[PDB]
Design a protein around this ligand. Structure first.
Ligand code: 9ZN
Ligand code: 9ZN
Ligand code: CL
Ligand code: CL
Lengths: 356, 356
């Protein structure tokens, strides 16, 4: 069998250099970074270079934290539950603004915050398929604790106006969090440009293992731990370090940014080649704006064919894709690993499956 | 160089069968278990057998959860913060009882719960080096939400009276949590015998990777998520599955129990061989009871030599050990991998370092 992988917004294959760089921490360099003996101290240099690559990747500065969590889900839960006690209960600012595009755990966590009496404004998504920065302006009551807006949407591919929201946030003096999880590797990420207080990512969406992610925290800005115990990550997230994954995510991050041009030049081009052809066949439209999108994603609907049905069929010809809602549409999410071969084939296999 | 590893209460070497069983999930079986296509569905059987081994290892029953977390630290934070909203705020039972032996994150989390007005009784540790079940009895105000007692202590090796506390808890109708993290692999664990509502473990203390652990939850008993998003682990802990680690921890668990006799027969014997000799040289006593201890741990003090100083020196001769308080003492924590060779050598190297 020869399968075609087109589900990268949902997870990605660990890069071989990533797989390789981790291996020695699964073999012989197994000690606890916290221990003082040689087995501990050995791990130090490689953790440090890993972390370096992480800050380097998002343009964090030496005085900021990028804390290693066990996934973006953890990161996001930690921001929202954190600013709840720090700013909603204690500073009394009982409002958080966010969007409806936000992945479940963000929405879901907010939901639970309402259950404890938080006022949460869930910004509606427009016909262009986006949010506009001006919308965010409109919703910041000065008793607002936090704005949270995803950097790009995992369905549409659609990049939101993050740098602008950073401004609005700076100006209005409110805390800014962006879930960047579908931006890393797809387009450049600059926390500095973003006036982000808080930024989230998950390793597995840029060719690292599943089971690790990060939260960037701006220097000075504070966030009551979601994992108390305070023994690791300057006390901000206790619990023993996942050395292998950290070292991996480091490399993953590094490589992800190095391929940033290739993502735009080649992967985006492969996305347009796929999207062109598909769009040509009868009553098949792309959901949302086609202009401000991460390079690798396209979300198509075929009038009359349920998306769940299209996916089932595609699976049978060994092509892996997912569903985004619009009823439901097909989510085709490329990586640096797809070639034109696989694209051509996909267009063939799509079309034939369509008419049936 | 030929190094001797004696720090297993602080982390352990990933077993080669563990390392091996994971490898294909880092190579080619990389899909998201949640996806519906083949890349997702492939992972299913191996996750299932992994989970099987986990329940099998702690004697959980089909109707209980064993939820995959990203470490015991996560597990413990989740129990304590969970029962806080479920039983302290909502059912109004504003008391949690626990011990002073409990690892940091447990104590530390409780600490934060006091900051929100929880009444927490931190049971003192006796001269025998333990807790007595009767102590727990004494402290259960009927407005008590939870008792939390570690199964064995990570310093002394000392097993606490867990089955008895299970009784006391059942009788008094209060919620029971045991942090078992230093029991798995060292002695048999039975959640059933323990009338445990909640049980914690971390993979890396029994030859799995760091970065994964579990929380056992009894059927019916509920626990507001610490990771909202509700997409995974019957909604109880959202966030994408760390397939490799799960599959690994599975094997790790399996093997850990299979070696349970060998732990008692051989590793305990190696511990006594080491402990005997060390104890013989001038003014060196073992901290706490020597009788109800996990087989692999010994915690010695040498009057007049600081422990931190002994460790430094030992490190130089490529022997890795840690410190437990008593001022401070030496924590020597064996695994199934140590041989008599390494033990004899340790006694030599210890003694010589002592006189200096
Ligand atoms: C923007 C964004 N943020 C966080 C996540 C979750 O990553 P993780 O589950 O590994 O912590 C995701 C994962 N998204 C999956 C998807 O694209 O299908 C999910 C929405 C099912 S979690 C995401 O898209
Ligand atoms: C009983 C017990 N429970 C949980 C932990 C923490 O495991 P983890 O950091 O991997 O989540 C530990 C880890 N103990 C380390 C030790 O033995 O030195 C620690 C106390 C530094 S965290 C533990 O002993
Ligand atoms: Cl919290
Ligand atoms: Cl919570």
């Amino acid at each position: 069998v020869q399968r075609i992988y087109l589900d990268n917004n949902a997870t990605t294959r660990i890069d071989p250099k990533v797989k390789e760089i981790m291996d020695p921490f699964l073999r012989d360099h197994y000690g606890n970074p916290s221990s003082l003996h040689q087995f501990g101290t050995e791990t130090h240099p490689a953790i440090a270079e890993a972390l370096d690559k992480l800050y380097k990747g998002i343009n964090a500065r030496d005085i900021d934290d990028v804390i290693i969590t066990s996934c973006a889900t953890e990161s996001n839960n930690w921001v929202l539950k954190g600013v709840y006690f720090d700013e909603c209960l204690k500073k009394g600012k009982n409002h958080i603004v966010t969007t409806v595009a936000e992945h479940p755990a963000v929405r879901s966590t907010c939901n639970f915050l309402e259950s404890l009496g938080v006022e949460v404004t869930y910004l509606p998504i427009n016909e262009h398929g986006s949010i506009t920065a001006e919308q965010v302006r409109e919703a910041i009551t000065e008793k607002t604790a936090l704005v949270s807006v995803m950097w790009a949407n995992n369905e549409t591919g659609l990049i939101f106006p993050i740098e602008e929201i950073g401004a609005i946030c700076k100006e209005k003096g409110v805390l800014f969090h962006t879930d960047a999880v579908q931006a890393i590797g797809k387009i450049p990420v600059d926390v500095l440009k973003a006036n982000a207080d808080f930024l989230s990512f998950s390793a597995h969406k840029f060719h690292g293992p599943k089971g690790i992610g990060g939260l960037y925290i701006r220097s000075g800005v504070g966030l009551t731990p979601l994992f108390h115990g305070g023994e690791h990550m300057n006390g901000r997230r206790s619990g023993t370090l996942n050395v292998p994954y950290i070292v991996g995510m480091g490399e993953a991050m590094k490589l992800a940014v190095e391929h940033l041009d290739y993502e735009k030049e080649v992967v985006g081009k492969l996305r347009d080649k796929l999207e062109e052809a598909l769009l040509k066949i009868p009553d098949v439209m792309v959901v949302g704006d086609r202009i401000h999108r991460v390079p690798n994603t396209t979300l198509v609907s075929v009038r009359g064919i349920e998306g769940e049905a299209m996916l089932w069929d595609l699976n049978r010809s060994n092509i892996a894709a997912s569903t985004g809602s619009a009823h439901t549409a097909i989510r085709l999410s490329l990586s640096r690993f797809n070639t034109e071969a696989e694209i051509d084939k996909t267009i063939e296999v799509f079309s034939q499956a369509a008419v049936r």
